Amino acid sequence: VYIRVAEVTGLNEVPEIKREIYDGNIVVADIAFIKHDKLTLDRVLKDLRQLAEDVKGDIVGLGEDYVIMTPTGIKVDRNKIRSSS
Amino acid sequence: VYIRVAEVTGLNEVPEIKREIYDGNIVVADIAFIKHDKLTLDRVLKDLRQLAEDVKGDIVGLGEDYVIMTPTGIKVDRNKIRS
Numbered sequence: 541v542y543i544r545v546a547e548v549t550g551l552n553e554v555p556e557i558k559r560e561i562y563d564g565n566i567v568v569a570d571i572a573f574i575k576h577d578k579l580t581l582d583r584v585l586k587d588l589r590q591l592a593e594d595v596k597g598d599i600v601g602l603g604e605d606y607v608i609m610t611p612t613g614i615k616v617d618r619n620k621i622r623s624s625s
Numbered sequence: 626v627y628i629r630v631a632e633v634t635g636l637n638e639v640p641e642i643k644r645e646i647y648d649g650n651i652v653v654a655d656i657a658f659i660k661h662d663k664l665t666l667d668r669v670l671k672d673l674r675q676l677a678e679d680v681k682g683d684i685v686g687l688g689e690d691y692v693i694m695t696p697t698g699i700k701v702d703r704n705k706i707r708s
Contacts, residue, residue: 541626541698541699542699542700542701542702543651543693543695543699543700543701543702544701544702544704544705544706545687545701545705545706546705546706546707547705547706547707547708549707549708550708552708553706553707553708556706557706560706565702566628566651567706568653568687568693569706570688602630602653602691603655603690603691605688606687606688606691608628608653610628614626614627614628615627615628616627616628616629616630617627617628617629617650619629620629620630620631620632621629621630621631621632621638621641621642621645621652622631622632622634622638623632623634623635623637623638624637624638624640624641625637
């Protein structure tokens with residue numbers, strides 16, 4: 541397993557993200573660039589959500605600008621680590 | 626293996642980050658809180674870099690606000706997926 545970072549600027553990064561997930565790797569995708577091209581953003585996120593369903597993987601937003609995508613059998617624990625105090 | 630996000634406000638989240646890494650889990654740490662308090666940042670980073678070395682995991686910046694930390698056996702491929 542490795543983690544790879546994607547700089548998502550349009551629909552042309554989706555096929556390589558799919559390939560990494562199918563390879564059992566984790567992708568953290570930067571969507572900052574297309575946050576204001578909502579049509580393009582919606583299509584990408586539709587594709588990446590369908591991918592997660594197709595592989596029984598997970599997909600979780602990370603702040604405003606990133607999405608974390610995991611392959612089969614790797615989940616995101618949604619309870620954050622916070623101050624012990 | 627799972628991934629867990631950490632909200633790193635100070636020195637008090639480092640013990641739990643270490644526990645997750647030792648356990649074989651991945652941590653994505655949001656360091657935006659302490660990014661501009663460079664002494665605190667260097668203390669936290671020294672601790673997390675030492676942990677990465679110790680377990681032969683990895684640690685790499687994700688843009689400005691985040692650090693991705695990986696356990697033994699898991700690397701971060703620094704070549705990005707780009708157009």
